[PDB]
Amino acid sequence: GSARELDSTYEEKVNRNYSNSIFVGNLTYDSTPEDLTEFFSQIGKVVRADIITSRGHHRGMGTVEFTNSDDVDRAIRQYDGAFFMDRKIFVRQDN
Numbered sequence: 280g281s282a283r284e285l286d287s288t289y290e291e292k293v294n295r296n297y298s299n300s301i302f303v304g305n306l307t308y309d310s311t312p313e314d315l316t317e318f319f320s321q322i323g324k325v326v327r328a329d330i331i332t333s334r335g336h337h338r339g340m341g342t343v344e345f346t347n348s349d350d351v352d353r354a355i356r357q358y359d360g361a362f363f364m365d366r367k368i369f370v371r372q373d374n
Contacts, residue, residue: 300373307364308339322354
């Protein structure tokens with residue numbers, strides 16, 4: 280008896296839960312740590328951003344540090360793909 284039957288199951292889960300830091304590899308080479316600070320820190324608190332270097336070789340990439348280990352990811356969910364001075368930032372987590 281019966282025909283065309285089916286079955287499936289689902290769950291919610293997370294991984295790699297550690298650190299308080301983030302990296303950005305495709306932003307504008309004119310960006311300052313202050314430009315990333317006023318951007319990211321609307322979520323809560325950036326404690327440090329970094330982009331400018333003493334050698335200055337046109338790098339186009341930098342780092343940001345938060346007070347948080349989960350809301351720091353909830354930031355990126357709203358900012359990865361941001362066209363930023365016409366040039367699209369893309370984010371990588373710490374490790």
